[model samples]
Target: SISISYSTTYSGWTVADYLADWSAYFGDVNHRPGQVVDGSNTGGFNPGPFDGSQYALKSTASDAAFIAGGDLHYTLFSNPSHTLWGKLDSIALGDTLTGGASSGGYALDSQEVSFSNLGLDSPIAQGRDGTVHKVVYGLMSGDSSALQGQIDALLKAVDPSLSINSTFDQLAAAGVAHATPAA
Candidate 1:
């Protein structure tokens, strides 16, 4: 049914246990609810220390009106510079997101993402970028509030400086060089 993932090993920073409460929503049985997978991202940005990374998360639910649209995706960044995952990148709120990175740090690739209902922001996302940290999370759910709660719980454990509102940067970084598409 659904799953989530991001990491090569358990570091001091992780949301595994905190998210355990949602155990019912993850794991494969659909055989599945959702399970975490150690996926690889060969494109987009990278997590090279100070080098920015373009992160992506998406919902796999086919519910036509799912808040985390299966028809759409979202993107963000794990700026080691910002500590916890930070900054929402520019992405159109619809099917199809553009992406890719190499040489000039640009290319067109397809990546999916998820966003909060109150605004165009993600609840929780696990991802990295090109050439460096590579990962992805496809959380499955249709309830917007449920997604928000998931993200909120993460905020409680991951970082105190972040809030759903602050993340509503509204494609604010769309024009930045770091703006990669959420295929």
Candidate 2:
């Protein structure tokens, strides 16, 4: 038997489906967080848009405006860390992220995030200051080249101009900002 074990914790705002009634959507079993495949964010699925909305951690959804609360979530150590959803920042278009917003942004209320492989010094395990990377979606299986490419595609669909390397930088920035006390 081939046993493949990979431990990497992906941290980001778990977005709601586009049409999902976020507040009540969580109650349903099938649509719960981490259940469905996150669309590439390219377009619609089966002739319609995906069910969830893009809950930005440091960046806003690619298509919508005025992101609502209780729609964002993050996890550490492959475990759910922030369950009671909270806001981090209001996303805007053309917002080039070098670091996080300086004022009036989302707050985690003194939360902690930690992973088995990522520490304060890890490369991919950095934090975000302004913008987030699409590669952040590949946290759990960091070494999977196939998954990484899929995550890349998902991100490019969100913004075509973002190259793989640039997206990597974006995630590193956001990850560093998001990391706090270890869980």
Candidate 3:
């Protein structure tokens, strides 16, 4: 199993500020229609096939101090087969994530994260952000430097940005092991 939790804080933006356009914003990304696959009609609430999978997001926000946290999950492909040892490998950070200005004012600085089936753990990378933020990833069963070469290679493919900081490599170098290091 893999567990990841991350958060970001909006300096002058309040929960209400972000929530105002939340519904439309959510619909635009999460509810958008995907290409028809295998003659299956896909649109407006019906989940399409895995190959036609589209990215969506749901979030919780607090108005007190203006903070928000998010969890992203996906059903890629037809599931129920292949690979062992599920894991989350990389995190991608960028400014154009929210479909740019087309998202109106509800655009979120979302991170593009990926899940992997590779047996070894990979380096988790963090993207550039204006607000204070954090990202973590873990493997339910694993080793330290044993699979270092394999893990880092896969992680690098997930996130090719050199600017991003790699938590896996950092932790490994620091002598941290297992999933505990992510926590």
Candidate 4:
């Protein structure tokens, strides 16, 4: 599989700071209309359709934190919103994430696209102030490294100065079987 990688850091970050970065890189993090929020990931929320479409968030935390951790706490869109970034699944800069760096997952049009169901090795690192920080997401999943060229191209478009710290060649290829070095 292909894994497009990127890393970034902030000396201090608010949910706003992280949200800004989320939009800059991935684009589109808005709430949708009539989306479901359920603790039951066993498919109670709108049947076959996934969270990106049917549900807003599937959280391990109690119902309250899940609401606070997700966008539904404040606004519910009338039309629709973007599912590509953390916008909908994340609280605002003024607000706080009670569950810390992990809890709720973002619903991508495809689950692999967002931090939530992406099965990331390191979940987003958020802390302090109004409070969230050290946000780093190192990979985008795909079937082959061929998929990375386009993904990295999007990053380059976002910031032409962006530098790649690694390459996905025959050795450090975008991983599925090798997602963790445990193999």
What lDDT would each prediction earn against the true structure? 0.27, 0.25, 0.25, 0.24
**95-174 per-residue lDDT for model 4 (tens digits):** 11232124443322222112122211211221110111112111111011222333334334445533132222211232
Name the TM-score of candidate 3.
0.20
Worst 10 residues of 1 by lDDT: 62-71
Rank by lDDT (best first): 1, 2, 3, 4
TM-score list, all predictions: 0.25, 0.19, 0.20, 0.20
lDDT for each residue of candidate 3 in 1-183, tens digit (9 for 90 to 100): 222222233222322233222322322212223532432222111132221112222321211111112222223332321111113232222122243124332223543222234333212132211011111111101111222333444445544431113443332333321222111
Candidate 3's C-alpha runs over 4 A off are 1-50, 61-151, 154-183
Candidate 3's displacement at residue 57, Å, is 2.4
**Local accuracy of candidate 1 as per-residue lDDT tens digits, 1-183:** 012221222122223332332223332112122332323221123332222434333223221111122112233233322122334332212222233344532222322223322222323343333211111222222123344454454443434544333222322222101223322
**Range of the 10 consecutive residues with the lowest summed lDDT in candidate 2:** 1-10
Ranking, TM-score, top scorer first: 1, 4, 3, 2
**Model 1 spans with C-alpha error above 4 angstroms:** 1-34, 40-53, 58-84, 89-91, 103-183
